[PDB]
Amino acid sequence: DLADRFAELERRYDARLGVYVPATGTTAAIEYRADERFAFCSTFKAPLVAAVLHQNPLTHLDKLITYTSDDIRSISPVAQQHVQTGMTIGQLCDAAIRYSDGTAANLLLADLGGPGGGTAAFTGYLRSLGDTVSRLDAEAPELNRDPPGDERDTTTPHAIALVLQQLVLGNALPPDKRALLTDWMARNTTGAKRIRAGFPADWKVIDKTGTGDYGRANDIAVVWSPTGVPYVVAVMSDRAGGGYDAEPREALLAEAATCVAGVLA
Predict the structure, then answer these.
(1) Which residues form the active site?
(2) Catalytic residue among 8, 36, 128, 142, which?
């Protein structure tokens, strides 16, 4: 029936939807199209920032980075103001998580090194986490625009949920570096209408959204029950049907999250 319900939401909203909540001690995994590739979009920033943290003294955050106005590529709510000033790595980390700024992400890929602008290093970070499925190949914003059926810059619900889970709840990071990342997510500003809107207001929710072309709209979150029991939730969607210009459907992500909250509850 939970399969039968996600597939209705797919009819109602005319989109592909993918769902993943890993198993815990007392609950089975929830999965609907958990292994199909979906575009990474802006969600990837959350592991990008773990990548940046797990490989540079906590003192690296204080490093100043200079860019030019030429550097800004896509959506940069934060970036434009500080261009003359510059931003530190820690300020970039924050802006990439709480605001999904394209430019900040761009720099922190450049700050990982290697070919592909950073994208080989970064996919390498994911591999270190046991994720052999995902891959990043472009920077902002070409990464949001690969066509349906194109493998590059794609993940699955299942893959990106097991990543998230080691970062936040797994010992993939030192307790202090772990606290930063969690706090940046706990204070995300881009996520009000997605997963957070599906869960009751007394569940704690921390997340990272993604939005793109072809009606792509993602959200990955770690939720805490009022009792303090944590779960990891990945929710992915798209609407290639309407082609490049298809509108993404948040209500979909937010509805799909209520079905999950009910199952968990």
Answers:
(1) 42, 140
(2) 142
Cα dihedral sign, 149-41-124-173 = negative
Give the range of the structural domain holding residue 134, as residue numbers without chain letter.
1-265
237 is catalytic: no
Crossing angle of helices 175-186 and 157-168, in 10° steps, is 120
CB atoms within 10 A of CB 97: 29
Is residue 139 part of the annotated active site? The answer reads no
Q: What are phi and psi of 46, to 5 degrees?
A: -60, -45
* 123/205 Cα distance (integer angstroms): 26
136 neighbors 40 (Cβ within 8 angstroms): yes
How many domains, in total, are found in the chain? 1
How far apart, in Å, are the Cα atoms of 90 and each of 22, 115, 154, 173, 250?
Answer: 30, 23, 26, 16, 30
Strand extents, DSSP E, the chain: 16-21, 30-32, 38-39, 64-65, 87-88, 154-155, 204-211, 217-224, 230-238
d(CA 27, CA 172): 23
The rounded distance, in Å, linking the Cα atoms of 198 and 252 is: 10
The contacts of residue 105 (CB under 8 Å, 6+ apart) are 42, 45, 48, 96, 139, 140
Adjacent-strand bridge partners of 16: 238
Instruction: Kindly write down the DSSP assignment for every residue of 107-123, as one continuous string.
Output: HHHHTT-SSGGGHHHHH
Catalytic-labelled residue, pool 42, 74, 76, 237: 42
In single-letter form, the type of residue at position 230 comes to P
